[model samples]
Structures are given as structure tokens and as C-alpha cells.
Target chain A: YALNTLQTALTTRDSFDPFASTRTFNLAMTDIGEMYFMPPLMEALAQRAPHIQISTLRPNAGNLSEDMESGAVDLALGLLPELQTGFFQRRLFRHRYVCMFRKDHPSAKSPMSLKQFSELEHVGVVALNTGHGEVDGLLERAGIKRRMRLVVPHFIAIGPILHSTDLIATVPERFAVRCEVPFGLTTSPHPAKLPDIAINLFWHAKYNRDPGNMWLRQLFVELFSEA
Target chain B: SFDPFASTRTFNLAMTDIGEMYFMPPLMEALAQRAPHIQISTLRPNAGNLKEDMESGAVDLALGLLPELQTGFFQRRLFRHRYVCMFRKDHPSAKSPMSLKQFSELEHVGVVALNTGHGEVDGLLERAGIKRRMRLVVPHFIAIGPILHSTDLIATVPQRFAVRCEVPFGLTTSPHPAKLPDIAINLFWHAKYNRDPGNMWLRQLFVELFSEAH
Candidate 1:
């Protein structure tokens, strides 16, 4: 009886199809990932899978783990703090940290030393994920405290702040690269040792065999293969 | 009948510097979409004068987390704003969920907010009994965000503002330590303007903005 039931369940599951019925596939991404990744993927999805609808959204801050488990999110892309279980993930890309300041700023014109890095007024990104191995922690360990001039919550604000003031900000290299033309910024090596940042694509393990989920997963892998 | 949409009356917002971020951008967009003729300006009076400011016809409405309620002012609860800790994307504590102990060990940036002219984090922390470190006292909450992004320092800010920071500046936010109380923001008006045509429209707009429907 058990074998018969298993056979029936397998056959019924196999017959369930994602492409046959048109539906919306909800994709969840962090704010940064939505800005950086969603545009191209949306364009590609529109052309390739016209029958399926796409809606992009952000995840709950205090409920990252529960949202995915409850099927509120189909897939997540970006920097998520580690959850204890239930997410299948693949690293998307990695980037290094760089110091950014306006082109006319004096610090952008010179080779900045650790002492200069500490002495000059700096800008910090306010966030939740401050753990070991970041630039600040390394400086603290070295007993070097930099002068923080301004703190902004968004990386978008860093460019204008750097352009309008003499302060320097340490930011991800890709963000620096992306903002170079608009902010007219210069970049230098981060004076302190910090961990490289990584972006990842995550989805609940329950969706591992769902055809629609697999298609979305494969779409991202191929889209970011060179990244 | 006066066309509220066509009238060139300005809606003066009586708010602290921190209050502007909560309403300005989206409110402007809404005004543009629905009431283009209406202009907006801000009054940066301290909390002690808000009631008088409204009564004297110096301001239209006051929007903020009231430290204490005063008599003769009509008040409506807008929404509760919770605090959250913001740090750089690469900061060590940002790597995962942060415990209260982990949060207390990091340095903080203080703001002169909540009706206290001086840095009042001590009173806010008095009940928590957690010994946190602070090296800088900033005059404006706006100053806290940029300093937080460029350096390793953390700032406890309104969650809405923290959400605004996460993407563009590469700043990340954690749930504020559970000990801190959430701020209850409200929209208050002088009873005299409660029935005024232009004032009624402004109040209705704020009601919609503060509603779950928005």
C-alpha cells in the first residue's frame, strides 16, 4: 500500500506544470540588489517569458527567515545575513572596498597613508551587519581612530556629501565605479584591511524542484554568469 | 467655492529637522500629483513652541513625535516610528544578527533630539543600563547618516530614514536594541484652523498620508 501511494504521489507531482498556466512570479531582493540587478533581468524576462508576470519587492527586515519559509518571497538576491536554515544559495559576485571623494578634494589628489586616512575627516555607512574584519574593526584593533565627519544612511547620499565637502568615504568599488561619472569622484585603495563584499541569490529549499523557481534560478545564473 | 487645488496657499510644516525626512519627499510627490498649486515650507521651532506657533498663525500643522501633549491642541496619532541601528555595509556587526551586548560594545553617534537641547542618550539609556560608547555629539540628525556611512560609527535612527539609506549609500540597518522605546508621531493643529477650508484640505491630506491606505 505504501509503495502504491508513493507511485501515485510521484506521478501527480510530475504532472504539475508551471508553464501551462500563466501566473505572476514574485521575486524578492534587497534594496541594493533591486537597483543593480532588476532592470536587466526584468527586460530579459519580459522578452523570454512573456506569459509569466514579474513583481519585484523588498523583504521584511526582522522577518528575513520567516518570509522565505512562508512562501511570501519566491527568491532573494543580495546581501542577507546568514539564516539558520531553509535557504539554498549561490554566490553571485564579489567586489572590494575603495575610498571615494570628489575630484577637487585634496585627499583624492594624493597617495593616502594610514595616518592620513585616520587624520582626515571620514564618512561611514550606517548599517546592521557590522561584524569582524570590516575596515573600522581593523582600525580599532590597530588603535587608530579616524575622525568621522558625517554619517549618512544611504550610499546614494555619499556621492553628494563627498562632492560638497572635503570628507572621504570608503565604499564598495562597484558603487564607486557606478557613481564615477555622476559624482565625478576619485577612488583610492582602502587604507585599512576590510573584507570583500559578496552578493548572493537565495531561495527557499522547498522550491528546489519547482519548475518555475528553477527557471528563475537558471535565469539569474545565466544572467550573472560573467559577473 | 474655493478650489483648494488651484489656490496658491502654502502649507507650512512645523517640524524638527528630523521630522522633515519623514514627510517631505513623498508629500511633495503627492502634492505635485494632487495639489500642484500648494507650496510647502518648514518651521524648525523647538517642541516647546509648537502649540503657540500654531495658535499664532505662524504655522499650519505640526508633525512629530510629541515628547508630551499640551492642552487646547487637536492631536491625531500619525504612526509609530521605531529606531534602528545603522552601520556601513562592510562593518563587522552588520555581518549578521546583532545581539544587545554586541550592539553596546560599538561606538555610537549622539543626536540632540526629543525636546532635549543637549545630548540626551544618557536618559534613553538609563533604563537599559547598557554601557555604550560615544565619541561625537552632532547638532543635527542629518549629520549622523553621512558620518555613519564613511566611518565605523553607528547611529540609531528612525526606521523609515534607515530604510531610505540601505541601498543608495550601501548602509545597512539592524533592529534597534529592544530596550529603546518606539516614538509615537502625531499630527497636531490649532482648533481655529480645524474648520478652515485650506486647513481642512491639509489635514485630510495628512490623514491619507498617515493611513495604511497610502
Candidate 2:
């Protein structure tokens, strides 16, 4: 066990040269983060460090803290509040909730009222892993219960469903913007007052000074940070 | 025969991300109409425990071009899927069916986690000395629609999936320029559950709903 520790120490001491190194970095992100972050992140990697590979894991997957501590997971990106202790974090961006609907829907012409928001048939996304579910809770607490027609487990199907149906979806601002043109969808500020979410870049403090980890963390900040 | 209307069990299916996007919406609708009480869940085949999961009855059925489950499982061919080049509806080359040269020239979006038989498109193209210019490589099919809609990068994806995306994403599809063989998507269940009533019911439902030859 001492030899193993010594070996790991030596390896961690070596300078990480992303240009020459072939490393697979594991990122823990929800599907919403995947949609918002992957396009630009991968585009940057293709030019800067073509050999580096990325595999995304679900933050709610088993033993994320243990995985991050053991170097099984490199960095996690999202509004992950549970990753607070023993981890370092940087704010990537802040996004608010927006109601997304088909572009030609009856409500597209004007900003929605709280009554329209509550009365309309809605599609709810129960993303158990991320904090996006806070929108649902906040609305329920405020006595503004939406008429939910469908509740899905992920944001992936929201675009297709909203595009084909009249069901409006309350989703993250970046997600709504990214999907607006492709899905033929439009977004409006959720009529009900809701809190904005902070998407953060999280890394275990154990590797805070590790060159490769630091490089990746900096890359995320440079590419995505709106703070 | 199993009664789905009375059964409240959740049936777990193993499929890739592409399979979920292509299959789940319709499958959910069917279950709502014919088997209101029955619930559905999806598991990724790449989870590495699928073989054991299916054997232990933890997974009810798997769909798509799964060659990995062939030897130890019972399978029914659902449909034949052909590859198509998909891009934005207003892409410059969208006017006509692309030729091999035009197809090879465009920057492509490559899906790296396509363990389904669809991954063969890259290999077949490589063997033919037709290396595509991949501008972006994503791990899931869910990202393809948004990326393709916003960029000029084209992707070679299954015809059915492309057809579904065309209207929603304002995308168009053309027959693949190269002579790639069509892949057969199948419904698979473990041989251990061959006689299980719920298993049989779900299998028949999939075959009835998706199988083109029927």
C-alpha cells in the first residue's frame, strides 16, 4: 500500500502536457449540462487537445464523492450543491427558468401571465440528479400548480415533445436558448417569480493543484463562464 | 396471456440513447392506451451488466441493433434500418441527393458511443477510403438534432430517427451515397424469461407496434 501511494504521488507530480498526453477525463453532468456545455467544450478540445477523451457520468450515480476522491471522476459540472464539502467549485454561469413552447403556439405572440402559465397544459421534467426540480417545488409552494400533461425524467425529450405538442415546458434559460431554433420553440420568462440557478465547475480538493485537473477547470471557465 | 391492464409492474428495457429517442415516445403512448397501469423504464446497454441483468430478470427487454445479446437471448427482428445523411433543411447541399464526393466533403458530426450496429458506418467508410471530416464528436444521439440544426455539419444516422427529426428540428435526410448494408433492429429478451407471461406480453406488444414485416 505504501508503494502504491508512492507511485501515485510520483505520477501526480509529473507535469501534465495536454498536447502530448492521451487522457480520458470523466465529467459528471446531467443531460441538461451535456446539452448546454458539450458542443463548445468538445469543439475546443478537438483543436487544443485532440487526444483527450471525455466520458460523462450522472452526478446522481452511486458514490460520486468516493469516485471524485479516488480520481475515478475528474470534474463535475452543474448546479451540484451536494459536492460542497471536500471539493472546490467555481461559478460557470447563472441561468433562470423559462417556459418553452412551440413557436406557433397561441401564447407565442405575447409575454405570458401567471394565470396562463398555471392554466396551460404543461410538460414537467423531473431531473432527479440536478437542481432544476427546484422550479417545480418553488411553484408548488407558491400555490401555482401547473396542469401537468406529462412528466419525463430527462430534458432530452422535452424539445421533441414541445415541438410536436402544445405542452409548455419550464426549463433552464440556456437550454431553452440552445433548443429554440432547432426545435422550432420559443421561450418566455416564467411568469411566476423563480430563483435563478448557478451552474458551477466542481473538482475534488485532492486534485486542486494537479496540473491536468487545473487545466480542464480553467478550460471550462474560459469557455463557459458568464460570471 | 398476461393482463397488462391489471399489471402495475415496471418493465425495464435496455437500449442506447438513440433507441430511447426513437422508441420511447411511441412506446409510452401505446402503454397509456393498452396498458395504463404498466410502467416503463430504460437502461443503457453500455452499462456493462446487461447480460447479467437480463438473465436475472432485472431487465425485461432490449431493443435496437444489439448483436451482443444474440447468442444467449431470444430475438425478433423489428425492422430494417438504413443509414441516411441528415443535415439542416437549408443546408447548401440539401437541394439534391448527395453523391459520394459531396457526402465525403462535408464536415460530419460523429457519435462515438454508438455501440449499436449503426457504428459500422464509420468503419465501412474508412474501408472504402472515404474518411469523413468530423468537426464534432458527441457521445450521445440526443445532441445530434440540436447541433445539426444550428450548424452545417451533417451526420449519418438511421432513417427512422432522421424522419422523426426532420419536422421538429427542420432537418432533411438523403440516402447514403455509399453502399452500406441496412441493419436489422430486433427485440431481445433473455431465454430464461421465454415463458414468463409479462415478458411475453411486452415482447408481443413491441413486435406488433414496431415490426414492419407484420
Candidate 3:
């Protein structure tokens, strides 16, 4: 059974059963690296599913699905959506993209076309198994090989790279706006037109009907879309 | 082992951070297609707590921060995060803190996982002569919202998390004292299961699948 734990957490609280709190089972959630970093979703889970006593784990971004299929993880919340045979998944949020450049950067002003955007040193996110990402795929589709400034796995560190050097990252809109990253960095809507990420919630059918599992699935749907 | 709940339990090899997950669509797709017998899963707020769970035999393997990478463990350096300070979007004092002198004035500072990152932040505060009162010491970034929404608290966290959480919570983010800290990730496993056939296959598949997914 496959369960998209990331989607589950993002939308876990509101869909919660205010009264389904007394079950006694050890439920575990796994992620490749910083599952504890997303902030709002984790905090929501702390309140909505306090009984679950969430246990955070790591699986390097390299080979997580193998671990998922090997019963290495009970549920996963953060792996990127990709084609696979053993696991099931649903995307929760299509990451909103923003173009970043040095504040008042000399060549910052371009026609705002994907072509011009690809001309700069692109700072992209990379995973262990996959060297780069969909954004790069989009670049390849356009016949413009991205001149990647660097392949950073985590997004937080991109700030320093942005601050001290001349690289741009198409980071999440919110995080980009987060006050702490760096100065001289500006944001614009992603050059590519993409949909609100369909962060699919998934789980192997094996656990689909279990009372606790069923409750969790239902709980996620409730919390994800809540106000 | 968690059999009674097996019907209810789904297992996943996890990646901890939100930013990285955005780059892994293919990996998620592969799991859905391959593992039909198990419940595949991953976490969102990727933390370094997998070690405790792995020690209890409650988890199979984790991909983010591992149990303090000691000797004799099978592992790989996954990623690194350079620390930075984040504040409420319209912080009253952010005059582009370039020197340590300006950084020393914030009366209060916000921190996520005060206990976890205490040693590092405290050392930085002491060195910079920037006294931090830990106005809002939260276990996670989500709590940073309430503390910042009403009070004047400045948090020092990884650049990725600050960026990811700032907007969702209706807050703004910025850079920290020029001298940042280090937050990196690595993959790991216990000696016992390091060579298990299934585990071995999982690791191999992970490399390929995670590669393709990326």
C-alpha cells in the first residue's frame, strides 16, 4: 500500500475527526531529509494528530521508493511525483515558482520569456537518484540546456549562493519571500506555465481499508483544503 | 513487526525537506507503481529524528539527516544548508544587517528547535555579541508564525525552511548575520540491515528511481 504522506500532512488538520482521537497504534512517517522543516503543515499535524506521536525519519533523496517498497517506510510525505511500479502517490501542492535575480542586477530586465530566463546561470534543485528536475526537463524541451550555476539539494542554502554570486533559483514563492534568506534577490512568476501542483495523496491499497489508515486518509482530505 | 497495524501501516524511505520534494516527481511516481504490497510514504517537515525511530526498529531507513553520522555506518553526504536569519517581512530593524554591530541590536530573536540548534546559534550569538532572548522557541517553524504574528521575534533557521514557511504563515523572510551556520544531510543505515538483499535492492533502486524522479 502506498500513501502520500506529504500531501497528508499539508492537508491533515482540518479533515481531522474531532472525536477519533483514542486509537492506539504506532504510525510512522518518513522523508528523505528535512521533513521537519515545512513549518505550517508539521505544526498543524502536531495539533490535529497529536496522538500519532509522529516519528520523523531520513532516506537520502537517492533511493527512497526502494525503501518504501521494502516496508522501509510506512508512509512517505515528500518524494517528488514520478513514474514507479511499487508505490502510489498523490501531489498536494504544485510548487509555485518565482524567478530570482540579484536586486538591481544589470541584466535583470529581459523580455520575461523562458528563453531569456534560461540564458542566465540557473540554480536548480537536485535529488540523489535524479541529478536535476522538471524545470530542467522543461528547459531541455525548449532546446536550451540550462547553464546550472550549481545543483543544490536543499533550497535554504540557495540564498547564500544567490547573495554572493550571480545565480538565480526558481524557488517556492513563499520561501522566497521568507524574511531570512538574503538581500539583492528578487522574485517573479515562474517563466513556465504550470498547474497548481497536484500533490497526490497515495498509499498501497493494502492499508486502504484499515480503520486507522482509513481515518488518516479521510483526515488528510479534511485538513488540506481547510481555511 | 508492526503487523497488527500492517494493514493500516504504510512504509516509506523518507526525504525530510519541502524544497527538495519539489524536485522529485519521478521518484514518487515509481513507488506508486512498484510497491503494491506496502504502504509507501515520505515526510514533509524533514527533521533529524529518524535516528531515534530507526534505533527502535520502528523505521526501515531515512534519507535526510541521519543519526549523528558516527563511524562504522553506511552513509552518503546528501546535502547542506547554510544558516540565515529570518524575520517578520516588515521587520522594524532590518536595515540590511551587514556588520555584526547591527545584528547585536535585535532585543529578541525567534528560533526553531531551540534545543536542537542551541549550541550553534548560541555560539553565534555570543560571538557576534548579539544577545538572543529566544523570544519564541519553537519545535518547528509552524509555531514561528504565532510568535511572529503578534510579537517582535527574529528566527535564525535554514534558508530553505524560512523561505518555505514564511509565506504560508503570512510572514516575511530575510538573510541572517553574514556569518551563517551549517545544516547538511546524509543517507544512512544500520550495520544489521546494510547488506540485506531487499535493503540492497532498495538502495540500488533508490539511486536509479530517485535519479529518474529527479
Q: Show where candidate 3 strays beyond 4 Å.
A: A1-37, A58-72, A78-91, A102-106, A109-111, A115-119, A130-134, A172-185, A192-197, A223-227, B1-214
Error of 2 at A206 (Å): 15
Supply the TM-score for candidate 2: 0.68
Model 1 scores a C-alpha lDDT of: 0.63
**Docking quality tier of candidate 1?**
incorrect
Can you write out model 1's per-residue Cα lDDT over B5-27, one digit (the tens) per residue? 68777666776545555565456
> Which residue pairs collide in model 2, if any?
none
Q: Write the per-residue lDDT of candidate 3 for residues A1-227, one digit (tens) a residue.
A: 23554444444343335345534322222211222233433345445654343323333433555544443444554444553554556554444556776676656553356766767666566433322246556556767656653454445345444554456677655456652333446776767764333344555533443456566555555655322
lDDT of 2 by residue, B151-203 (tens): 67788888887867887777888888988899888899999999999999888
Least accurate stretch of 10 residues (summed lDDT) in model 1 chain A?
A: A12-21
By DockQ, the better pick of 1 and 2 is: 2
Q: Please, what is the whole-model Cα lDDT of each candidate in the order they appear? A: 0.63, 0.78, 0.49
The superposed Cα distance between candidate 2 and the true structure at residue B38, in angstroms, equals 2.3
TM-score, model 3 to reference: 0.42
lDDT of 3 at B57: 42
**DockQ of the two-chain complex in candidate 1:** 0.03
DockQ of each: 0.03, 0.17, 0.04
Model 2 misplaced regions, further than 4 Å: A1-30, A38-90, A95-154, A161-173, A177-197, A201-226
